[PDB]
Structures are given as C-alpha cells and as structure tokens.
Amino acid sequence: PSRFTKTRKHRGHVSAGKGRIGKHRKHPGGRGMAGGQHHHRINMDKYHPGYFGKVGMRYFHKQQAHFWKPVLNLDKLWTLIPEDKRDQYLKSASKETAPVIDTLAAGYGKILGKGRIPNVPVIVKARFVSKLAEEKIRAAGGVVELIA
Amino acid sequence: AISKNLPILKNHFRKHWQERVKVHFDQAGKKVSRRNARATRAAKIAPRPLDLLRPVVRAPTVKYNRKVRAGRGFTLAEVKAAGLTAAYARTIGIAVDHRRQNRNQEIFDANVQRLKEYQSKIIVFPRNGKAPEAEQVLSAAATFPIAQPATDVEARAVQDNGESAFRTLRLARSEKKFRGIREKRAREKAEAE
Amino acid sequence: TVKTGIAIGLNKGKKVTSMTPAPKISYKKGAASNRTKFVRSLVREIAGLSPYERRLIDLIRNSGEKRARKVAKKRLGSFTRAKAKVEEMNNIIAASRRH
RNA sequence: GAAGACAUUGUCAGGUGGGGAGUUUGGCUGGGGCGGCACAUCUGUUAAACGAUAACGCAGAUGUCCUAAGGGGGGCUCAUG
RNA sequence: AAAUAUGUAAGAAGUCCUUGUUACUUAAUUGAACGUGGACAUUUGAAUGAAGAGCUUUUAGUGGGCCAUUUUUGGUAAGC
RNA sequence: CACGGACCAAGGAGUCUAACGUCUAUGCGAGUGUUUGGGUGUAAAACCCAUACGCGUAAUGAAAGUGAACGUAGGUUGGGGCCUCGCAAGAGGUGCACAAUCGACCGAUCCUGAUGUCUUCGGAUGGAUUUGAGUAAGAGCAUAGCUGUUGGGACCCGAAAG
RNA sequence: UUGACCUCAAAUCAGGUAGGAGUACCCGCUGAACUUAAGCAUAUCAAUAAGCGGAGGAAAAGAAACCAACCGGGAUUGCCUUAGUAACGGCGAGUGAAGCGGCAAAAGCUCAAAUUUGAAAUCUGGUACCUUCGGUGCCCGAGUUGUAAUUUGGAGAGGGCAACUUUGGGGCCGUUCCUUGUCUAUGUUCCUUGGAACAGGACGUCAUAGAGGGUGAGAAUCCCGUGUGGCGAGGAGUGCGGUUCUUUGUAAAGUGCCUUCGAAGAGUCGAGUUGUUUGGGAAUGCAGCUCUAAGUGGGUGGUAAAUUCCAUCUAAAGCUAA
C-alpha cells in the first residue's frame, strides 16, 4: 500500500531528503537508548522524568489475580439489570420486591459512589464497597449484602 | 538514538530472530486436517461420540471462582455414588480422575446427577452382538452442557439492621491485622504469678 | 475451619457445605510398620554406631546437648535433623547404658 | 628391593605469577607535542551608557576561615595631623 | 554628562457614586481584596498601518560559516 | 593547478517487519475487537459463532490500602449560535466548545483528633503557602494510509581487526 | 584320587548384534568472538554459531515429592493470552518468565520392597515333528545371590460371612486403508484471409466436461485429457459388520460387611563451599568436592533464621499415543 511514499518523489534528488551536509549515517548518536545520562539527557529530563532510579518495594512472585478488584460506580449500577426488567423495577419502588444485583457475576469487585442513583430500593451483592456507596444505597432504601 | 517526545519502547530483537520467525500460513490447512482427523476418528471408532463426559468443577482463585467449568474427571467417590466402578466408567465414556477430591456437596451432587443422566441417556451395546444401530451424536458436551448455578432470585425484601458493611469489612481487616499482638498480650498477661 | 461469608478477615470466603473426603493412603507413607521397626532395630544392633554418633554420645555425657545440637547441625544440615538425632542418641544412652 | 599412612591424587583456600590473556592510556589548543587551564566558579575591565556578548585578552581571586568573624541590644567614633 | 539604543503608559478588564462578604487588617462597620446597584458611549480618550487576529499539534533540514559599512580587542601588520 | 568520470548497453541504492507517536479516513460507540479456535464451504477464499482475553469505562499511593455531586455538577470574566424588542443600529435573556480564574470532590503527606472501646483499637469532624499522569454528565476500541521513532543486514557499497 | 562350586580365559565354537551415511526437524554435551553499551572489563551478543556424541518418523516430555491459597484445580505437549508484566540488570544498555483463564488434542499405567513353599509353578538353546513370522514333546542349561502368578499407593493383601454378575481364541466373506489398471460426451460443416485455420463470419452440438496441454497462428466440440459414474487387480489389517470351528472353565475378573495388616526406591534427599546457569532476587537449576539423614517422616508453599500451626504432594526405579 506504498507508492504514495516520498521516496517515489525524491527519485531524481541526490540525498533522498536527508541532506548534503549531515549525510545520513548509520547510528550517529548511538543505538536505542544510549546516552540517557550523558548526551541524550535533556530528552530524558523533560519528556521522561522519573526514568532513572528505583523507588519502592519489590514483590517476588506477584499474581495479579490477587489484585483483581474491578470497580463499578453507582451511576453505572443499574445497567447490570437487563433493560427488560429495568423500567418494571424503576416503577414499584418498594421494599419486598427489590431487585437483586450480583456485581460479581457481572464481573466487579468493589462498588463506588460516583453519583446519584434514583430513590429506588436495590439489593447490591458485592465483595467490597465504599462508605459513600453504602450510604447512598441505604439512603435510596437498599442494602449491601456482602459476599465472597 | 533518543529523539522527540515519544514512549520508551522495549522491542526485544537484538538476537537472530529471523531464523526463528514462524508464520502460520498453515492455519486453514491445519483446520482442514483437524476436521478430517475428527471425521476419520468418528468413523473408525464407532457410534461413540468423540469425547468423554467431563465433570462440572468450580474454578480456582477469586478472579474465576464465580465461574464453573469443565474439569478432567469424576472423583471415584462420585462414580461409586452414581453406582458403577471406575474401570467400567472408563470403558463407557466417563473421564475419571483419581487425583481430585470432593469437598463440596453441591459439586458432588451436580456431578452425580450428571452421571445419572448420562447413564440413562446412553445405550450400551452387548458384548455378544446383534448391534442395534444408534445413529451417533458427536458431542457429549453438547448433549450435557455446563450450566451456571444461580444463587438467588431477582426480587427480594430488604433486610436492614444498621451494621454498616463498610465498618464490617474494616473491622474484619483490623481483627486479622491485630490478632497475633492480642494473642501474645493475653498470653503474657495470663502469666500472673 | 468454618468460613464467614465475606472477602476478608481471619476466616474468609463462601459458606459451603463441606464433605470431608476419604483419607488417602498417601499421607500415611512414613508411618512405618511392625516390619521396618524390627529390621531397623536389628540393623542398629548389627552395624552399631558411626563416628559422629560416637562423638555425640560423648558430647552428651560431657558437654551437654546444646553443643551436641551444634555439632550435629554442622555434621548433618538441619537443626531439626540435629534435634531428632540428639534425641535418638539420648534414647540410646539412657535406655541401655544405665543397667 | 625402597618408601609408607607421609608422598601422590582430588576439592577448596592463600601467595607468587607480563610467562600469557583482555582492555585502557582525557579535552581545550593560531598543527599537534612540551607548557598552561581560558574544563566548575567570583571581582573589575575589554564591552561599543538596558540586557547579552568572544579570544591561551588585561589585572586578580576561589576549593577555605568563623560559637563568633552568626543574631539582637546598648554605648562610643575611626585613619591621620 | 550626551547622541544612538532601552522600559512603562496613552483607559470598557476604564473613571466616579452608593452599599454588601471576610476567619485578613484596624482603636474603630477604619482599611485591603472581591462584588451588587447606578451614572458616564460613539473623538471611548495621541499618530501611521494592519494582504486578517489568536491557538495548538507534529515533523524536516541545520547546529564547519564567510564578506561589507560602522563600533571594537590582540597583533608591527595581514586576503590575520 | 581539489576528487570521480574514455565510451555504450543492461543491472544498480530509505525496503520488510515488531512495537509505537501525531494527523487523516471508515465502522461501531460505553463500548470495541468475527478470523487462537469452532461450524460451513462452488475450499487454502467467502459466510456464521460461543466462552474468554486485550484496550477503554477510576484514579492514587512505596505499600498496606482508601477511592471521586454542599450547590439547578458551582461562581466570575469572555464566548459562536439561538430567542425577545427594535425599521435598522443597538439593548436584554440563554449561553455548547475553548480560554483564564476562584472554589468544591477522590487519593498521598502533615495536623486536629469525637461518639464508642478486647484500654489499644477505631476513626468521626474540621483543616493545610504541600502533592497526583485525577473527578467536576463518559470517548474509546478496531482497521487502513502518509509521515516520523526504536530494534533489526535496516538507503547502497566500504576497514584495520576479533 | 575323583567330582563339584566361585572367579577368570580361549576357540575361524552355535547363533546374533554395534559401527558408517544422512542430519531440515529432535535429545544432550561443549562453546566463542564480531556486535550493543555511542569508550570499556560486569553485562549484551548467546545459555547463539562453530566442534562432539546420540535417535525417530516425529523426537522429547508425561500421568505430580504439581499448581495453589480458590466455593480450590488436577499427566504431558501446543496455540491465544498473562506480558515487554513480576523480577534480573555498571538498576546502565538491555534482558525477562510462571500460575489462573479460553482452545486444540486427550489415556492411561508398570516395577522393587510380601514364604508359591503341600511341591521354579518361570525362561533361553538344541533336536524330532507340525496346521512353521510360531506351537508340542524330549534333552542339556539359566535360575532359588530369586525366574513366574499376586500387589504399586488412586490403593492393596491375609482371614471370615453373604450371595450375585461377565467372559476366549481362530478360518471365511463384506467393509476400511493403500497402490494400480480400464471404460465412460459432443463439428473437424460452409465462405474469406493465410504457407498452415486453432483467426474472422454463418449454421449447429455437448456441457455434473468452457481445467490444462498438444496439434503448421487465440480450438469445449481434432487428440490426450477434464467432469460424472461403473468394472477390475494386487496387498495391510483385524479397526468394524455378517458367517463358521472350537468352550478352553470345578479357571479368571468385578461388587458388599467385620477384623488384623498395609512392606512404598540413600553416597540419595538435605546442607556447606566452588563454579556455571536462570527473571529467580540471603543463592532457579545443574555439576564438582566435603558432610550426610529420617520415618505420625520427607519435599514444596519465590526474604535468610528460630518457635508453633496449616495446606498440598509422595522423590531418590519405570513405560505410554494425539
């Protein structure tokens, strides 16, 4: 998918657009990441601050599955209900008929409070939650049933 | 070699990689060979359905334990409860695994029921003959799927008691954190003359 | 170990009706016998002690068991192996050498 | 015959080891080498009355010293004749 | 103590009058800062111009320089 | 009075890849990506597809860990466009995007440290010349293209060496 | 003196086997430097090239001394991903896996350690015969310094009680596979050009066949073929289906309850040191030397150590397709 390349246009011109003085050479400043502390330093500082050095603790044999904890916000919480039942449950805003939501089956670990669900009772089954999420749910009329 | 604002790339090509490039032009051909092998196997073998009946199994870690999965085999206990022996099961199309154990009655009963369904829905040819033709199926897995068990219904009442789930979690965490200190403190306080 | 039903704490996870599987016959591997006891007793009788075991019974008679465990940890590898070897030596000493 | 639990052999450890191996052996520079540092800094001047401004330009300095030679207050007024 | 060169300003984000907020400030509802409300407009606050003004992204080549007038250092001087 | 070039023919030099950036086009859009694989086939094409997985939708902190609405999702200044009056010029209202600014929210840091208490735990509430690659009604995913980047024989030829 | 045993020899003893080639792919050993780091020694190149030994149609690996920390999975291999990640690193250049998950493909087992002891029940060889890729008899021998049956950890064995179930080898014929032969449609009609019609034009035919090639120029219809079906031949194999002859069997296997037992691999594991290697970090693996275990033990649980617990496997012997 090539022939709209500038080589096709530089045909005829001597240097192929790399210059007569500089004279395109092989690796005139180094290979790869050479000189990060010596002659490419002003690039690394300013555009890569933090590149050199260690910081924190090591973890030998980290498994990310231990740290699987994907988050759901309350604004997106009502999407775990299918659209078929959603208006039914938006109406009949009641105890004794309140929808159950398994956020873990949806694929979520922690619930978080980014804002303003409607004043409808909801049962939210979650591994973890936050303070505001629990407050907002309990204020809308629901509860959080912890699970594992 | 370092230039304008761009990410640091880590491209691992400082070896003779061109000698070990593999391009899968053989993809569609290997597919064809694989289909032909399945077909040849079905025909050559039998009216037998190309695969053993595998069990339902609860997956490992917190990431995946919510799912339920197809395992390898049927835990000699489960087989004995289904009412047959391991050797006959292996002859009859059941995968057996000696090196796993039942700790959960739900999975145990699910797999036993699965075995009973299989034992009812098969017909086993005699040792002698007369070969009543049976018009085979190719997938025990497709005849016997892997269903996710549900926990609770959509709708329930609200059972609140003001326990503050967040506080609950924090107190569990604190209890685990400060268990050993307390179990040393009480121990060294019991040393009262 | 009954679980709690939550995702953190001392006991942690799903409440599940347990089933307590049968005890495998492995997990009972080094749980010796009558025969092995007999054979090992008789072979100890025949062969006897080795040089560092002589050193250890001497060090237990003279310089106590702390230095004995030290010596046995240098001679063997582990502190637990040293412990068990010193106890073997004490069962040798206190049982036969008294009467 | 001699010798003898020593030598030898094996593994560690120390010393020696250009015999040999591998590598390195600065820059500025009225060519380079010798010389010097103009290679990190300060004052005056060059420097052309904002600022900036070179030369192995001029005249010099720095890698320290101080529990006071820092801080505050009070009183006094110095060199010289 | 020049000449040349150099900074700022030449107003609507402005000026004036009334009066609100504050944990700052004051001896003090005195100030400071920010405001409400009101008044002053088409010479709305020198000139000339404005082939548009403002803003962002990315990337090439270059990073040996040389000459002339004038100012000037070293040098006897030099196409130094 | 620097280098190559006696002449002619043919050959002859910024390519392909992996991962990427900005920009442009297209498709869907709080999602997106069928093509590892399966089914199917007028067969290495085209057609269909499950579960996963990747990126994205949540930052922050060394980590433990906590985790984004006082308020019509804030105020002020300006803002295209729209609306009302006006013959028009103008006036007033509303004001997306964007910009400047003052605030609020989440996280780290430093303080305060309540009701309660396995009496060493817990952490409210209120703050700060501190800090974040943040929130403050989502924009991304995939494919393709120019250009540019890195590694690769890496535009072509070229050492003394090892 | 005679005859044995043990160890060691020789024979052109009877019968066999190894060597070398090939070496794309595979199992190992050994092992660089160029190069990158804008210099260069660690590093990198690379656990690569070169060198050596060894195999097959695949090899290797392989049915846990595993992964984990789950509501727990469950031989091995490979793909997608994990992941340019955790980690290593003059923490510089650079390097850099694994568990989970989805898929392909799936397959499981064998020994040693047990007195058969009321009967070495086992096996090579030679010879005679035979329905001879083997069988029966007879005779020497090997072998109890342990050949068969039985058992391998998932279990299992010895006794006792109770009953119930299920069985093996051939011959033939079809089928499967492989190889191969053969048969199976239509214009060479007319005119022009041309040396030649396979061109052009007119009329037509076949088509589950207009793919290709050849023939004096671009031919479905001239030839071979192609397409579709049919008829045959010869081998491998019992992988399957119909047949026929032998019932081997007071044999073997499976299942329930009570009781007594339950052997499980050492110069090894492990440790210290050295060197090499690894992402492997107070030491990932390997090897050398030194030390050297145990049995309610041992290993592993990615920060050295002691104490207490827990979880999970069961090494130091072995086979096996895709």
mmCIF file with all atom_site columns, C-alpha atoms (C1' of nucleotides) in Angstrom, chain G residues 153-219:
data_model
loop_
_atom_site.group_PDB
_atom_site.id
_atom_site.type_symbol
_atom_site.label_atom_id
_atom_site.label_alt_id
_atom_site.label_comp_id
_atom_site.label_asym_id
_atom_site.label_entity_id
_atom_site.label_seq_id
_atom_site.pdbx_PDB_ins_code
_atom_site.Cartn_x
_atom_site.Cartn_y
_atom_site.Cartn_z
_atom_site.occupancy
_atom_site.B_iso_or_equiv
_atom_site.pdbx_formal_charge
_atom_site.auth_seq_id
_atom_site.auth_comp_id
_atom_site.auth_asym_id
_atom_site.auth_atom_id
_atom_site.pdbx_PDB_model_num
ATOM 1  C "C1'" . G G 1 153 ? -0.316  -46.073 46.878  1.00 0.00 ? 153 G G "C1'" 1
ATOM 2  C "C1'" . G G 1 154 ? -5.899  -43.999 43.054  1.00 0.00 ? 154 G G "C1'" 1
ATOM 3  C "C1'" . A G 1 155 ? -4.654  -48.407 46.725  1.00 0.00 ? 155 A G "C1'" 1
ATOM 4  C "C1'" . G G 1 156 ? -3.935  -53.274 48.199  1.00 0.00 ? 156 G G "C1'" 1
ATOM 5  C "C1'" . A G 1 157 ? -3.173  -58.004 50.952  1.00 0.00 ? 157 A G "C1'" 1
ATOM 6  C "C1'" . G G 1 158 ? -4.454  -62.098 54.726  1.00 0.00 ? 158 G G "C1'" 1
ATOM 7  C "C1'" . G G 1 159 ? -8.633  -64.384 57.316  1.00 0.00 ? 159 G G "C1'" 1
ATOM 8  C "C1'" . G G 1 160 ? -14.247 -64.753 57.995  1.00 0.00 ? 160 G G "C1'" 1
ATOM 9  C "C1'" . C G 1 161 ? -19.722 -64.118 56.285  1.00 0.00 ? 161 C G "C1'" 1
ATOM 10 C "C1'" . A G 1 162 ? -23.126 -63.325 52.197  1.00 0.00 ? 162 A G "C1'" 1
ATOM 11 C "C1'" . A G 1 163 ? -24.576 -64.001 47.637  1.00 0.00 ? 163 A G "C1'" 1
ATOM 12 C "C1'" . C G 1 164 ? -24.960 -62.135 42.518  1.00 0.00 ? 164 C G "C1'" 1
ATOM 13 C "C1'" . U G 1 165 ? -22.982 -60.973 37.735  1.00 0.00 ? 165 U G "C1'" 1
ATOM 14 C "C1'" . U G 1 166 ? -19.300 -61.169 32.921  1.00 0.00 ? 166 U G "C1'" 1
ATOM 15 C "C1'" . U G 1 167 ? -16.067 -63.999 29.965  1.00 0.00 ? 167 U G "C1'" 1
ATOM 16 C "C1'" . G G 1 168 ? -11.674 -66.832 24.956  1.00 0.00 ? 168 G G "C1'" 1
ATOM 17 C "C1'" . G G 1 169 ? -9.468  -67.763 20.557  1.00 0.00 ? 169 G G "C1'" 1
ATOM 18 C "C1'" . G G 1 170 ? -9.203  -68.828 15.231  1.00 0.00 ? 170 G G "C1'" 1
ATOM 19 C "C1'" . G G 1 171 ? -10.995 -69.762 9.435   1.00 0.00 ? 171 G G "C1'" 1
ATOM 20 C "C1'" . C G 1 172 ? -14.166 -67.425 5.684   1.00 0.00 ? 172 C G "C1'" 1
ATOM 21 C "C1'" . C G 1 173 ? -16.908 -63.335 3.450   1.00 0.00 ? 173 C G "C1'" 1
ATOM 22 C "C1'" . G G 1 174 ? -18.079 -57.893 3.177   1.00 0.00 ? 174 G G "C1'" 1
ATOM 23 C "C1'" . U G 1 175 ? -16.281 -53.132 4.828   1.00 0.00 ? 175 U G "C1'" 1
ATOM 24 C "C1'" . U G 1 176 ? -11.862 -49.733 5.835   1.00 0.00 ? 176 U G "C1'" 1
ATOM 25 C "C1'" . C G 1 177 ? -6.989  -48.205 4.075   1.00 0.00 ? 177 C G "C1'" 1
ATOM 26 C "C1'" . C G 1 178 ? -3.000  -48.268 0.363   1.00 0.00 ? 178 C G "C1'" 1
ATOM 27 C "C1'" . U G 1 179 ? -1.432  -48.948 -4.607  1.00 0.00 ? 179 U G "C1'" 1
ATOM 28 C "C1'" . U G 1 180 ? -2.887  -49.617 -9.602  1.00 0.00 ? 180 U G "C1'" 1
ATOM 29 C "C1'" . G G 1 181 ? -5.369  -50.646 -14.461 1.00 0.00 ? 181 G G "C1'" 1
ATOM 30 C "C1'" . U G 1 182 ? -9.526  -49.832 -17.595 1.00 0.00 ? 182 U G "C1'" 1
ATOM 31 C "C1'" . C G 1 183 ? -14.131 -47.867 -19.714 1.00 0.00 ? 183 C G "C1'" 1
ATOM 32 C "C1'" . U G 1 184 ? -17.401 -43.812 -19.618 1.00 0.00 ? 184 U G "C1'" 1
ATOM 33 C "C1'" . A G 1 185 ? -19.886 -36.679 -24.414 1.00 0.00 ? 185 A G "C1'" 1
ATOM 34 C "C1'" . U G 1 186 ? -20.446 -33.838 -28.437 1.00 0.00 ? 186 U G "C1'" 1
ATOM 35 C "C1'" . G G 1 187 ? -18.314 -30.188 -35.972 1.00 0.00 ? 187 G G "C1'" 1
ATOM 36 C "C1'" . U G 1 188 ? -13.030 -31.116 -37.897 1.00 0.00 ? 188 U G "C1'" 1
ATOM 37 C "C1'" . U G 1 189 ? -19.910 -28.474 -41.773 1.00 0.00 ? 189 U G "C1'" 1
ATOM 38 C "C1'" . C G 1 190 ? -19.760 -23.938 -45.150 1.00 0.00 ? 190 C G "C1'" 1
ATOM 39 C "C1'" . C G 1 191 ? -17.186 -18.923 -47.014 1.00 0.00 ? 191 C G "C1'" 1
ATOM 40 C "C1'" . U G 1 192 ? -12.717 -15.078 -46.730 1.00 0.00 ? 192 U G "C1'" 1
ATOM 41 C "C1'" . U G 1 193 ? -7.569  -14.262 -45.473 1.00 0.00 ? 193 U G "C1'" 1
ATOM 42 C "C1'" . G G 1 194 ? -3.243  -17.044 -44.972 1.00 0.00 ? 194 G G "C1'" 1
ATOM 43 C "C1'" . G G 1 195 ? 2.363   -21.200 -46.316 1.00 0.00 ? 195 G G "C1'" 1
ATOM 44 C "C1'" . A G 1 196 ? -0.558  -23.630 -42.283 1.00 0.00 ? 196 A G "C1'" 1
ATOM 45 C "C1'" . A G 1 197 ? -7.043  -22.062 -39.716 1.00 0.00 ? 197 A G "C1'" 1
ATOM 46 C "C1'" . C G 1 198 ? -6.551  -23.257 -33.984 1.00 0.00 ? 198 C G "C1'" 1
ATOM 47 C "C1'" . A G 1 199 ? -8.286  -16.329 -36.919 1.00 0.00 ? 199 A G "C1'" 1
ATOM 48 C "C1'" . G G 1 200 ? -12.859 -13.787 -38.794 1.00 0.00 ? 200 G G "C1'" 1
ATOM 49 C "C1'" . G G 1 201 ? -18.117 -14.684 -40.271 1.00 0.00 ? 201 G G "C1'" 1
ATOM 50 C "C1'" . A G 1 202 ? -22.726 -18.189 -40.933 1.00 0.00 ? 202 A G "C1'" 1
ATOM 51 C "C1'" . C G 1 203 ? -25.223 -22.632 -39.148 1.00 0.00 ? 203 C G "C1'" 1
ATOM 52 C "C1'" . G G 1 204 ? -25.098 -26.144 -35.106 1.00 0.00 ? 204 G G "C1'" 1
ATOM 53 C "C1'" . U G 1 205 ? -23.981 -29.976 -30.898 1.00 0.00 ? 205 U G "C1'" 1
ATOM 54 C "C1'" . C G 1 206 ? -22.457 -31.473 -25.798 1.00 0.00 ? 206 C G "C1'" 1
ATOM 55 C "C1'" . A G 1 207 ? -21.910 -29.410 -21.054 1.00 0.00 ? 207 A G "C1'" 1
ATOM 56 C "C1'" . U G 1 208 ? -22.219 -32.761 -13.033 1.00 0.00 ? 208 U G "C1'" 1
ATOM 57 C "C1'" . A G 1 209 ? -16.977 -31.929 -19.155 1.00 0.00 ? 209 A G "C1'" 1
ATOM 58 C "C1'" . G G 1 210 ? -15.688 -23.978 -21.374 1.00 0.00 ? 210 G G "C1'" 1
ATOM 59 C "C1'" . A G 1 211 ? -9.432  -27.068 -16.012 1.00 0.00 ? 211 A G "C1'" 1
ATOM 60 C "C1'" . G G 1 212 ? -4.981  -27.589 -18.540 1.00 0.00 ? 212 G G "C1'" 1
ATOM 61 C "C1'" . G G 1 213 ? -1.851  -29.386 -22.586 1.00 0.00 ? 213 G G "C1'" 1
ATOM 62 C "C1'" . G G 1 214 ? -0.944  -30.723 -27.755 1.00 0.00 ? 214 G G "C1'" 1
ATOM 63 C "C1'" . U G 1 215 ? -1.743  -30.170 -32.931 1.00 0.00 ? 215 U G "C1'" 1
ATOM 64 C "C1'" . G G 1 216 ? 1.843   -25.897 -39.183 1.00 0.00 ? 216 G G "C1'" 1
ATOM 65 C "C1'" . A G 1 217 ? -1.307  -18.804 -35.676 1.00 0.00 ? 217 A G "C1'" 1
ATOM 66 C "C1'" . G G 1 218 ? -6.058  -17.121 -29.911 1.00 0.00 ? 218 G G "C1'" 1
ATOM 67 C "C1'" . A G 1 219 ? -9.563  -24.868 -30.698 1.00 0.00 ? 219 A G "C1'" 1
#
